[PDB]
Amino acid sequence: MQLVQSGPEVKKPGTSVKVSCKASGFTFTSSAVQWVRQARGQRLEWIGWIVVGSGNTNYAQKFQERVTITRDMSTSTAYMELSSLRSEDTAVYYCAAPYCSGGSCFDGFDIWGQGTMVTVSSASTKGPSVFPLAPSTAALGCLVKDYFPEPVTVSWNSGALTSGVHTFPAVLQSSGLYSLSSVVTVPSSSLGTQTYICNVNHKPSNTKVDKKVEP
Amino acid sequence: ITNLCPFGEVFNATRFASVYAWNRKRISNCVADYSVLYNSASFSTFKCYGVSPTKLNDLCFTNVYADSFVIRGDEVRQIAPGQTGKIADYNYKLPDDFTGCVIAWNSNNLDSKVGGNYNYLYRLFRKSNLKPFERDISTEIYQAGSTPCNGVEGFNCYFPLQSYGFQPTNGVGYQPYRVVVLSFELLHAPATVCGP
Amino acid sequence: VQLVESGGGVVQPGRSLRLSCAASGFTFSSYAFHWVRQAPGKGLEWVAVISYDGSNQYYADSVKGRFTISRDNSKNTLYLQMNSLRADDTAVYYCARDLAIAVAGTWHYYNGMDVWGQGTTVTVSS
Amino acid sequence: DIQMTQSPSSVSASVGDRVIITCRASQGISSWLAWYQQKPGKAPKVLIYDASSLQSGVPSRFSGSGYGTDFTLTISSLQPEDSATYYCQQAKSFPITFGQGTRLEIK
Amino acid sequence: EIVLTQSPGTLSLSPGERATLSCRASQSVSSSYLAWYQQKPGQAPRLLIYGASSRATGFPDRFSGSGSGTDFTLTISRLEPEDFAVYYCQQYGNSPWTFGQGTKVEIRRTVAAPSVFIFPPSDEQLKSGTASVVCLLNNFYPREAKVQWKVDNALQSGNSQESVTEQDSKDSTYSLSSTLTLSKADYEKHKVYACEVTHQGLSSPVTKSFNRG
Ligand SMILES: *[C@@H]1O[C@H](CO)[C@@H](O[C@@H]2O[C@H](CO)[C@@H](O)[C@H](O)[C@H]2NC(C)=O)[C@H](O)[C@H]1NC(C)=O
Numbered sequence: 001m002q003l004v005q006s007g008p009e010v011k012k013p014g015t016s017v018k019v020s021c022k023a024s025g026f027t028f029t030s031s032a033v034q035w036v037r038q039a040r041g042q043r044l045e046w047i048g049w050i051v052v053g054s055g056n057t058n059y060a061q062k063f064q065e066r067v068t069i070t071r072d073m074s075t076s077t078a079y080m081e082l083s084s085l086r087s088e089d090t091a092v093y094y095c096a097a098p099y100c101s102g103g104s105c106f107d108g109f110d111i112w113g114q115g116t117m118v119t120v121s122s123a124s125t126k127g128p129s130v131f132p133l134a135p136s137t138a139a140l141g142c143l144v145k146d147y148f149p150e151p152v153t154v155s156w157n158s159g160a161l162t163s164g165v166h167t168f169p170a171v172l173q174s175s176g177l178y179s180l181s182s183v184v185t186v187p188s189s190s191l192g193t194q195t196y197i198c199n200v201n202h203k204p205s206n207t208k209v210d211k212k213v214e215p
Numbered sequence: 216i217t218n219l220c221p222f223g224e225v226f227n228a229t230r231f232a233s234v235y236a237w238n239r240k241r242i243s244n245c246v247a248d249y250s251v252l253y254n255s256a257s258f259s260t261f262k263c264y265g266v267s268p269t270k271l272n273d274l275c276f277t278n279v280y281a282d283s284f285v286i287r288g289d290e291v292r293q294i295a296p297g298q299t300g301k302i303a304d305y306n307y308k309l310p311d312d313f314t315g316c317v318i319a320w321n322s323n324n325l326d327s328k329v330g331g332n333y334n335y336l337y338r339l340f341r342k343s344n345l346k347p348f349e350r351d352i353s354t355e356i357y358q359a360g361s362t363p364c365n366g367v368e369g370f371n372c373y374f375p376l377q378s379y380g381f382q383p384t385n386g387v388g389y390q391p392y393r394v395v396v397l398s399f400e401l402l403h404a405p406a407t408v409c410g411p
Numbered sequence: 412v413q414l415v416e417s418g419g420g421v422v423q424p425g426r427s428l429r430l431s432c433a434a435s436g437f438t439f440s441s442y443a444f445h446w447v448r449q450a451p452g453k454g455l456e457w458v459a460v461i462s463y464d465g466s467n468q469y470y471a472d473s474v475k476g477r478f479t480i481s482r483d484n485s486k487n488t489l490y491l492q493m494n495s496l497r498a499d500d501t502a503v504y505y506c507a508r509d510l511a512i513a514v515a516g517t518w519h520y521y522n523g524m525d526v527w528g529q530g531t532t533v534t535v536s537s
Numbered sequence: 538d539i540q541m542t543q544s545p546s547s548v549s550a551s552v553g554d555r556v557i558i559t560c561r562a563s564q565g566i567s568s569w570l571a572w573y574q575q576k577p578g579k580a581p582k583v584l585i586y587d588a589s590s591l592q593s594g595v596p597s598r599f600s601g602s603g604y605g606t607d608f609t610l611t612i613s614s615l616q617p618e619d620s621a622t623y624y625c626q627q628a629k630s631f632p633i634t635f636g637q638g639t640r641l642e643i644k
Numbered sequence: 645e646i647v648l649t650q651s652p653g654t655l656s657l658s659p660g661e662r663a664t665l666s667c668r669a670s671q672s673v674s675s676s677y678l679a680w681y682q683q684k685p686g687q688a689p690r691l692l693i694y695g696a697s698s699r700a701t702g703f704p705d706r707f708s709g710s711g712s713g714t715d716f717t718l719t720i721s722r723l724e725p726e727d728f729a730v731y732y733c734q735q736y737g738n739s740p741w742t743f744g745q746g747t748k749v750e751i752r753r754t755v756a757a758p759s760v761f762i763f764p765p766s767d768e769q770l771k772s773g774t775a776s777v778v779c780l781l782n783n784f785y786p787r788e789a790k791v792q793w794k795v796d797n798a799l800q801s802g803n804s805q806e807s808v809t810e811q812d813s814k815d816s817t818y819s820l821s822s823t824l825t826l827s828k829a830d831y832e833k834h835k836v837y838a839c840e841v842t843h844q845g846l847s848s849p850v851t852k853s854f855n856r857g
């Protein structure tokens with residue numbers, strides 16, 4: 001009843017990548033596994049499918065001479081390889097398969113994977129920078145600039161007040177780095193009030209900031 | 216010893232059949248010599264379920280059936296009374312109370328081609344588990360779901376045969392083997408296959 | 412389907428000559444290819460072969476160690492280098508293409524040559 | 538290195554005449570053979586593959602069969618567009634080896 | 645089938661209104677080889693009806709389904725909460741298989757666009773590189789936005805980058821921020837900025853700032 005995938009990866013342009021999809025809870029011998037693709041905010045795409053028993057494969061026209069799909073009957077795991085990576089292949093890859101118990105099989109793809117984020121670009125790693133914002137009772141927040149890996153979390157003070165926080169998604173800047181912003185309001189009908197502070201934390205780097213705001 | 220029983224037409228045969236369409240030849244009214252098969256040749260496996268290889272020139276029965284086919288290398292242990300797998304389930308089932316012999320030798324020089332041998336298929340994707348000494352040669356699209364398959368393959372409709380790919384470099388576990396199975400039958404009838 | 416050929420040379424005492432046969436009208440990346448020579452008036456002779464994915468290469472006995480084959484999927488073209496040509500290698504070389512017998516959905520290679528080229532007249536002298 | 542032998546080497550017949558061509562192998566190559574036909578100044582063309590099958594497009598006048606060591610090619614009626622040379626070929630192992638060839642005529 | 649079309653692009657109304665997605669397609673496709681899906685943000689798609697009429701196990705009642713040669717559709721008898729997501733088609737009976745574009749259902753609410761906030765500089769954008777400026781919009785459910793080309797003295801209507809959040813789970817709205825930075829500490833005549841945005845009502849709240857020199 002599961003198709004657990006591998007972890008996220010960050011590759012470089014021109015290299016290759018292999019993604020796994022391990023089945024558990026059903027008879028993997030008689031089934032079929034299809035692969036899809038989705039970017040951030042875009043629609044789904046189709047790649048190809050493989051019969052687990054026979055091994056026969058069919059690919060899309062645009063992914064034909066770039067993708068190979070293997071079988072690995074033992075241990076019940078299926079793979080997929082992408083060659084000649086480009087900057088447009090930054091997406092999330094899923095694997096789906098029907099439920100089969102004995103000879104009979106389901107009529108559709110009901111078991112789905114969990115995803116595998118793949119980012120391909122230049123640069124290696126860079127901790128972000130934090131700027132303070134100012135009022136002009138109004139709105140006020142933090143700022144973040146230039147971090148490559150992508151996952152980042154912003155808190156406020158420690159966890160309190162759970163107000164109209166608005167953490168916008170990151171945008172792939174021109175150079176290749178990212179940036180996001182976080183902002184709240186000050187409904188307290190005053191400027192001299194609760195002593196609230198910002199907070200940033202980046203995972204693939206020992207970097208932590210506690211920049212303060214206010215006038 | 217005037218008459219003699221023809222075993223060179225079962226062992227030294229050019230075309231030697233496939234596993235899912237195995238060939239059977241009835242033998243009778245001869246005088247067989249089992250001292251040229253056990254005590255000779257290059258047979259890798261000589262298993263005699265039921266009776267023993269020795270003292271086989273003594274007992275004599277009514278009919279003997281020879282079944283010949285070709286399988287892979289690590290698939291010769293599935294030919295035994297009992298056993299479960301993919302050949303002992305969809306291709307050739309052997310009864311649990313078996314009296315006979317199993318013989319196999321490595322024929323890699325004759326059944327291997329650069330690129331792959333396109334003969335010697337084996338059955339895959341069957342519904343039931345077959346019955347002892349039963350053949351099936353039907354080639355119909357295997358329906359693995361509720362929706363009927365109107366003669367066209369696709370999702371949940373598969374061809375029920377897979378081709379062995381035999382090449383001269385596959386490792387001992389994948390090289391071809393030629394198998395011959397003899398079955399001794401004593402069915403309330405005067406014998407005709409009595410030895411020397 | 413059509414194969415072209417180019418690369419004949421006037422006098423080739425001990426020089427390197429590159430021959431290329433270009434493909435057209437089918438899926439070039441799903442087939443294996445060949446090269447075959449024919450003496451000036453004698454029988455038909457085999458010289459090389461290339462795999463469908465390009466990993467494996469095989470050569471003849473009077474050809475190994477001096478001729479080399481390679482393929483390119485981008486231009487739908489494959490080549491065959493030749494080094495240190497003897498005067499006894501005059502021929503007319505042909506590009507070819509393997510027959511692929513498909514049984515039960517699996518493709519089996521190296522079964523013949525169905526599509527042939529026109530012919531390149533390569534002559535070596537002094 | 539399988540050596541292939543092809544006999545005869547030069548024959549002749551016209552219009553409605555049936556002719557036979559033999560090919561012999563040094564080993565047992567099973568049903569792995571092919572026949573060709575080359576006119577005096579053009580590339581060869583495959584005729585029969587798998588030692589029994591017929592290439593889609595070849596006229597049904599040709600037929601050949603065999604298994605093991607001996608093989609054969611038969612032409613039902615020699616129409617005046619069949620004056621060329623025919624070759625064998627073995628596909629069991631590398632290097633690929635052809636036959637010596639046989640030249641037809643018009644009586 | 646080689647291309648599928650989903651219409652209408654988006655729907656929006658208060659809970660309790662029957663909705664009819666339509667998935668009109670190309671030449672033809674067999675029934676029982678078409679299915680629907682549902683994907684909430686940051687999740688994997690689930691399987692809705694899997695035969696153009698046969699409903700999946702997990703989902704509750706109110707999910708119907710029809711089908712024909714070239715007019716497939718999906719009717720939800722009531723728009724109760726936790727049912728506002730994106731739904732896709734698929735045909736898997738004719739290679740290559742393909743997906744529809746997907747239609748996002750929304751919630752109708754009230755617009756409260758207050759203003760666009762500008763506060764361009766920190767202390768340090770000559771004691772740093774690229775000179776960054778940001779303006780922010782808030783509280784508007786419709787997806788209409790605008791920034792004009794000149795902005796301030798430096799036109800530079802190519803540096804503007806905007807990102808938008810998703811709807812609130814209880815106070816359904818959106819928020820939007822715009823950044824247009826251009827050069828580095830080497831500014832000499834493109835000091836100050838002024839975002840200008842029109843939105844559904846009070847029109848364009850013009851923004852004031854003071855020069856950077
Ligand atoms: C298959 O043919 C081989 C031919 O070699 C047979 O083996 C020979 O049989 C003769 C019979 O007198 C013996 O003298 C030889 O010693 C055997 N070996 C060899 C290498 O020649 C073999 O018996 C035949 N198989 C049968 C009859 O089942």
